[PDB]
Amino acid sequence: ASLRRGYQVYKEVCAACHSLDRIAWRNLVGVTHTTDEAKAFAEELEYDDEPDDEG
Amino acid sequence: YVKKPSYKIVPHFLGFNIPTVSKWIPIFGIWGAAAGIGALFLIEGVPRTRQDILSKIPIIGEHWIREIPASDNPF
């Protein structure tokens, strides 16, 4: 419960300046969040895809 | 009066004969059980071993029927 609250502090305060690059969304699952909550966090962001057919 | 001793030669091969080997047949059995138990024990963690063998054992078999809740599984 403290871990989950700590994630929220990270996300709302620290993440403005600090990265957490070694942690994937899947890592939160079953530790701090359910599969659905973590998928929701991931799905709100945009990531680079592979190039389209015109490259 | 006895003219000759009374005996036969039993079939043998590589210094084994059937009377001797027959005494060891049960021992091979137990060693086979030991090897079976040991092998199965070594692969008890393999998922297929649980799915196909261990979960089917009556009473005891529910020890190996374990599901991760869908909420707790990233994959």
In chain B, which residue's Cα lies nearest the Cα of A37? B71
| Contact indicator for A31, B73 with CB cutoff of 8 Å | no
| Contact indicator for A7, A32 with CB cutoff of 8 Å | yes
Which range of residues forms the domain containing residue B52? 1-75
Q: Cβ–Cβ of A30/B75 closer than 8 Å?
A: no
Q: How many domains does chain B have?
A: 1
Smallest Cα–Cα separation from B53: which of B68, B64, B42, B69? B64
| Contact indicator for B17, B11 with CB cutoff of 8 Å | yes
Q: Is A30 at the interface with chain B, CB within 8 A?
A: yes
In chain A, which residue's Cα lies nearest the Cα of B68? A30
Q: What is the resolution of this structure in A?
A: 2.3
Measured in degrees and rounded to the nearest 5, phi and psi for residue B43 equal -110, 20
* Technique of determination: cryo-EM
Residue A18 annotated as part of some ligand binding site:
yes
Q: Cβ–Cβ of B72/A29 closer than 8 Å?
A: yes
